[PDB]
């Protein structure tokens, strides 16, 4: 496998949701450091879907190859969920901005 | 509603997938200009999910307040699916980079 190319692909298709650095922060997705040898859905502090939580497989070259070709196929139920906004005043302020900008 | 606050929220939580300016572009999500007083899934040239496409309700403060607190709940089926990496060589390259970066 070609590392330099893989780095570019990661930066374009994955970096937006995942960090790989040790101690890396969780974003939309979980930090991926120490991924090889780790079972699905074990990154401490992250909230996985039951699908990702129960896949029951170990991440490594082979599993990643199948998974990466089509995530939903390998782990039916895996998806990105649009983060809700629980605070009422925040939703009110956001809508006020939306009402103005989407109409100007 | 506090426009100034909504503006910051929008930019930090929504701008990455949505643009609101008239003639704006579609990103991971559709441009939201003209959103109010119009039914769901009406953005020209954007392919929504059947879920978002058939919610049928009309966007306005009321409906937006309920939707924003929990998208999935107000529109069962709305989500983002993880795109696969069709090219076998890219998957290999990506995996090599991950193997390097997640251990170092
Ligand atoms: C956000 C829009 C993401 C993009 C783009 C990518 N992934 Fe992701 N990934 C994301 C989340 C929120 C999740 C968990 C979803 C769930 O079902 O709970 C994941 C998970 C993974 C995993 C598994 C991690 C684990 O089990 O600990 C891997 C290995 C993974 N994603 C890899 C990955 C790569 C390499 C991406 C680009 C090709 C990529 N993801 C993009 C969110 C997002
Ligand atoms: C990218 C990950 C997104 C983020 C972050 C936000 N939204 Fe989004 N939004 C996104 C998509 C891909 C879709 C459509 C999905 C589908 O089911 O087809 C949407 C949809 C909306 C809509 C409805 C548009 C319509 O009915 O025409 C609204 C009102 C909306 N999104 C608003 C919104 C706001 C204000 C966000 C941040 C607070 C936000 N979304 C983030 C993708 C993404």
Curated annotation (Swiss-Prot), chains A, B:
Residues the record lists as Phosphotyrosine modifications: 48, 97
Modification note: Binds 1 heme c group covalently per subunit. Phosphorylation at Tyr-48 and Tyr-97 both reduce by half the turnover in the reaction with cytochrome c oxidase, down-regulating mitochondrial respiration.
Modified residues (N6-acetyllysine): 72, 99
Any Gene Ontology biological process: mitochondrial electron transport, ubiquinol to cytochrome c
Residue numbers bearing the N6-succinyllysine modification: 55, 72
UniProt entry keywords in alphabetical sequence: Acetylation, Apoptosis, Electron transport, Heme, Iron, Metal-binding, Mitochondrion, Phosphoprotein, Respiratory chain, Transport
Record-linked Pfam families: Cytochrom_C
Record has Phosphoprotein as a keyword: yes
Note: Mules and hinnies are heterozygous, having equal amount of horse and donkey cytochromes c.
Protein name per its UniProtKB record: Cytochrome c
Organism: Equus caballus (Horse)
Lineage: Eukaryota, Metazoa, Chordata, Craniata, Vertebrata
């Amino acid at each position: 496998g070609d590392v330099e190319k893989g780095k570019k692909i990661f930066v374009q298709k994955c970096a937006q949701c995942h960090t790989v650095e040790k101690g890396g922060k969780h974003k939309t997705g979980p930090n991926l450091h120490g991924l090889f040898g780790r079972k699905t859905g074990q990154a401490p502090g992250f909230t996985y879907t039951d699908a990702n939580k129960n896949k029951g497989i170990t991440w490594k070259e082979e599993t990643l190859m199948e998974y990466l070709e089509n995530p939903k196929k390998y782990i039916p139920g895996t998806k990105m969920i649009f983060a809700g906004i629980k605070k009422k005043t925040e939703r009110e302020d956001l809508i006020a901005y939306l009402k103005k900008a989407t109409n100007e």
